[PDB]
Amino acid sequence: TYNIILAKSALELIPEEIKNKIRKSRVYKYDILDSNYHYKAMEKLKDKEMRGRPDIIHISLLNILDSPINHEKKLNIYIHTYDDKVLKINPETRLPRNYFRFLGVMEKVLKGERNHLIKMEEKTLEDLLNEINAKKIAIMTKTGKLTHPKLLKEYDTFIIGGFPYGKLKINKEKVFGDIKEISIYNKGLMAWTVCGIICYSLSF
Amino acid sequence: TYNIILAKSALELIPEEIKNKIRKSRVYKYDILDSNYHYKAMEKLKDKEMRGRPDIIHISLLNILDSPINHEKKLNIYIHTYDDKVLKINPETRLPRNYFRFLGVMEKVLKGERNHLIKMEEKTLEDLLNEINAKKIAIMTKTGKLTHPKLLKEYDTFIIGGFPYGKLKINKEKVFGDIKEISIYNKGLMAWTVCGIICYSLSF
Ligand SMILES: Nc1ncnc2c1ncn2[C@@H]1O[C@H](C[C@@H](N)CC[C@H](N)C(=O)O)[C@@H](O)[C@H]1O
Ligand SMILES: Nc1ncnc2c1ncn2[C@@H]1O[C@H](C[C@@H](N)CC[C@H](N)C(=O)O)[C@@H](O)[C@H]1O
Numbered sequence A, B: 001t002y003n004i005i006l007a008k009s010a011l012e013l014i015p016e017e018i019k020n021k022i023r024k025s026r027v028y029k030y031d032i033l034d035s036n037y038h039y040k041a042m043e044k045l046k047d048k049e050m051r052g053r054p055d056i057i058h059i060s061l062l063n064i065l066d067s068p069i070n071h072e073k074k075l076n077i078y079i080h081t082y083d084d085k086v087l088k089i090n091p092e093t094r095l096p097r098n099y100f101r102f103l104g105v106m107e108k109v110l111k112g113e114r115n116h117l118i119k120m121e122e123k124t125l126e127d128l129l130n131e132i133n134a135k136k137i138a139i140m141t142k143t144g145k146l147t148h149p150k151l152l153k154e155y156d157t158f159i160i161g162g163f164p165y166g167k168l169k170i171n172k173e174k175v176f177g178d179i180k181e182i183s184i185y186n187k188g189l190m191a192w193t194v195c196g197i198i199c200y201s202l203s204f
Helices: A054-065 A099-110 A125-131 A149-154 A191-201 B016-021 B054-066 B099-110 B125-131 B149-154 B191-201
Strands: A002-009 A075-081 A085-089 A118-122 A136-146 A157-161 A178-183 B002-009 B075-081 B085-089 B118-122 B136-146 B157-161 B178-183
Touching (some): A002 A054, A054 B054, A075 A125, A191 B054, B002 B054, B002 B125, B002 B191, B085 B099, B149 B191
Parallel strands (some): B136 B157
């Protein structure tokens, strides 16, 4: 099996820090940080530029969950969040295609309510890698070594940034497995495209 | 330069027959049929089971538009709809990631408002195929002949149903080019997954 991880993902409950600046409305009734609705209240938020984009996770998961490699039960799926929660997504999860419905599911999971298909734990990215015994880790990034996807089969673990803008940073000395930075294209792609390219390279 | 077509797509202004059963609301203000909001009003609509799913198109287009093969300007992109409209999607279209905003864009286009990146014409699928001079056509369907994605490069035109349930029906006698039915996997996949698999085959 392969592990696929969307890491430092822009999927969080609204940070206490800024709840005071959030005026609630009926157009958006979720406690999930979303820049489309909280852009102002996020102005002085640390790393604001990489937070508040849950649709990156939604769209990527729609791609991952439906991929042949996942239908063949050959994937382990994890969402690691900006604030160090890890969601293990059961391969048979039926993810709502509706964005708001999606937010509703995630809101409950992140608040610790039980979900037999999506397990949540508090955990750093590095600890996750060690506990699943990731051995050869490909960190996907447009600034890594250009690499043909037919070579991706050589790694057992793939990490894709689940965030809008930035670069994925990981503490080498805290990870037992070997980490390699890998680009599969010379332009910046969206996260779900990268997830798709990985999944399909694993089947074909 | 390849043609990719999402065909008989579940993307329509509310059908004349059931307009009287559907009121704009604050929850969903768009004149686009969506069964997540209009399920009951669609009870007695013909082919209801393959209509009212704009999200299939939204997600597929997000995959297509961000694919390397499209960044390299090697795609022509078409949405053919259930009611015989054809939307030509400029490769540089920046499609809203937000579903409702996507609906707002598509609603205007379908109503005939000028959009310089998305052109709309009344047109059947067969007519579309003839106009673009499709010669070697792969119709994707799980029931077709299984074909490793590696071979997709031999065709010039790909057709994927932009609908939830059923099978694409095409009058071959009305089509100049050659049509083969092709399966890329031994299981029903979602349309966006098939689009993605095709797009990535074309680049690797
Ligand atoms: N050309 C690429 N090769 C490998 N991974 C990529 C590529 N483009 C985007 N990604 C992944 O997509 C994630 C989220 C992106 N919105 C950020 C892209 C950013 N330009 C980057 O390469 O880090 C990134 O953190 C990367 O992991
Ligand atoms: N295993 C598959 N191999 C090739 N194309 C597929 C496959 N599964 C779905 N598609 C395409 O995706 C479209 C949308 C589907 N939701 C329809 C599912 C239906 N089971 C079918 O294969 O036709 C279909 O019209 C096909 O064009």
